[PDB]
Design an enzyme around this catalytic site. Structure first.
Site, PDB file in Angstrom:
ATOM      1  N   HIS A  40      44.790  42.825  37.503  1.00  0.00           N
ATOM      2  CA  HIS A  40      44.531  42.168  38.604  1.00  0.00           C
ATOM      3  C   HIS A  40      45.883  40.955  38.781  1.00  0.00           C
ATOM      4  CE1 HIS A  40      42.511  38.885  36.114  1.00  0.00           C
ATOM      5  NE2 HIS A  40      43.330  38.025  37.154  1.00  0.00           N
ATOM      6  N   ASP A  84      40.991  46.330  33.237  1.00  0.00           N
ATOM      7  CA  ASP A  84      41.727  45.201  33.750  1.00  0.00           C
ATOM      8  C   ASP A  84      43.122  44.848  32.766  1.00  0.00           C
ATOM      9  OD1 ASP A  84      42.939  43.424  35.296  1.00  0.00           O
ATOM     10  OD2 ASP A  84      41.437  41.888  35.052  1.00  0.00           O
ATOM     11  N   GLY A 175      44.475  31.093  36.853  1.00  0.00           N
ATOM     12  CA  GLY A 175      45.758  30.706  36.546  1.00  0.00           C
ATOM     13  C   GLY A 175      45.835  30.985  35.054  1.00  0.00           C
ATOM     14  N   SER A 177      44.687  33.809  33.979  1.00  0.00           N
ATOM     15  CA  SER A 177      44.289  35.214  34.285  1.00  0.00           C
ATOM     16  C   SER A 177      45.563  36.050  33.478  1.00  0.00           C
ATOM     17  CB  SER A 177      44.405  35.538  35.671  1.00  0.00           C
ATOM     18  OG  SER A 177      43.282  35.229  36.465  1.00  0.00           O
ATOM     19  N   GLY A 178      45.347  37.170  32.683  1.00  0.00           N
ATOM     20  CA  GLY A 178      46.304  38.066  32.101  1.00  0.00           C
ATOM     21  C   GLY A 178      46.789  37.448  30.793  1.00  0.00           C
TER      22      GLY A 178
HETATM   23  C1  LIG Z   1      37.093  32.312  38.520  1.00  0.00           C
HETATM   24  O1  LIG Z   1      38.161  32.811  37.979  1.00  0.00           O
HETATM   25  C2  LIG Z   1      38.487  32.947  36.767  1.00  0.00           C
HETATM   26  C3  LIG Z   1      39.896  33.311  36.452  1.00  0.00           C
HETATM   27  C4  LIG Z   1      39.984  33.691  35.147  1.00  0.00           C
HETATM   28  C5  LIG Z   1      39.098  33.505  34.116  1.00  0.00           C
HETATM   29  C6  LIG Z   1      37.679  33.131  34.593  1.00  0.00           C
HETATM   30  C7  LIG Z   1      36.542  32.571  33.626  1.00  0.00           C
HETATM   31  N1  LIG Z   1      36.127  31.587  33.680  1.00  0.00           N
HETATM   32  C8  LIG Z   1      37.466  32.807  35.929  1.00  0.00           C
END
Ligand SMILES: COc1cccc(CN)c1
Ligand SMILES: [Ca+2]
Length: 223
Positions: A40, A84, A175, A177-178
């Site tokens: 993603h 993912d 943020g 993420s990944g």
């Molecule tokens: C709501 O967006 C997110 C992005 C990465 C990780 C998480 C886990 N709380 C939530």
């Protein structure tokens, strides 16, 4: 990272920042030429930034290297976030040292209860928005498959695990993420998704990296 601590500069040497004019995702350096991140996080024009602490200041340990290619997992479904995971190859090999170092892939899957380190430059607020400049860290346990499935009915696949705290307060966030979930010096997870951040009974959900080791190795060997 919500409810974490300041890691300390270059104390997480495999942590990378993916930059497309700005930080947009984390990643993990797995050898001198390859980064693992979340599917993603896919986009064009990625520059991999290694050796970062403050992502807004050049502090002297950075290496900035453009991606030559990205490989999203062939079975990635963006709706369910199943599979993912994505590989990013660097245009040139990073110079490895004590502050820029690869993280080992798992030889076995980590169990519920295993203590891990989650890190990133994501939002530090559960309600508001505040992005840190320096790398944040969170120690968090892997949660049981049953508690994970109970938290998110109908949504947890065999390629996902929950980690964190059902009470809330401490979690990954936008943020992060990944980025990495590392347990006993192995990359066991990738920051994937959740419902908000640090909310009660809504722990972070992570890509189960041990399921992908064969794919990662095969892909690296031919690309
Ligand atoms: C709501 O967006 C997110 C992005 C990465 C990780 C998480 C886990 N709380 C939530
Ligand atoms: Ca920097």
């Amino acid at each position: 990272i919500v409810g974490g601590y300041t890691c300390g500069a270059n104390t997480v040497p495999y942590q990378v920042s993916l930059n497309s004019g700005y930080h947009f995702c984390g990643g993990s350096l797995i050898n001198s030429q390859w980064v693992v991140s979340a599917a993603h996080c896919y986009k064009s024009g990625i520059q991999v930034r290694l050796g970062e602490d403050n992502i807004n200041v050049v502090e002297g340990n950075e290496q900035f290297i453009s991606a030559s290619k990205s490989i999203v997992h062939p079975s990635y479904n963006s709706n369910t976030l199943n599979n993912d995971i994505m590989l990013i190859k660097l245009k040139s090999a990073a110079s490895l040292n004590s502050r820029v170092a690869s993280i080992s892939l798992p030889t076995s899957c980590a169990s519920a209860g295993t203590q891990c380190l989650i890190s990133g430059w994501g939002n530090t607020k559960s309600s508001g928005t505040s992005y840190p400049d320096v790398l944040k860290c969170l120690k968090a346990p892997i949660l049981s498959d049953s508690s994970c499935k109970s938290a998110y009915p109908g949504q947890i696949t065999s390629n996902m695990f929950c980690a964190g705290y059902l009470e809330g307060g401490k979690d990954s966030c936008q943020g992060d993420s990944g980025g990495p979930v590392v347990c006993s010096g192995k990359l066991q997870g990738i920051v994937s998704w959740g419902s908000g951040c640090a909310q009660k009974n809504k722990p972070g959900v992570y890509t189960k990296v041990c399921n992908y080791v064969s794919w990662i190795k095969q892909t690296i060997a031919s690309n």
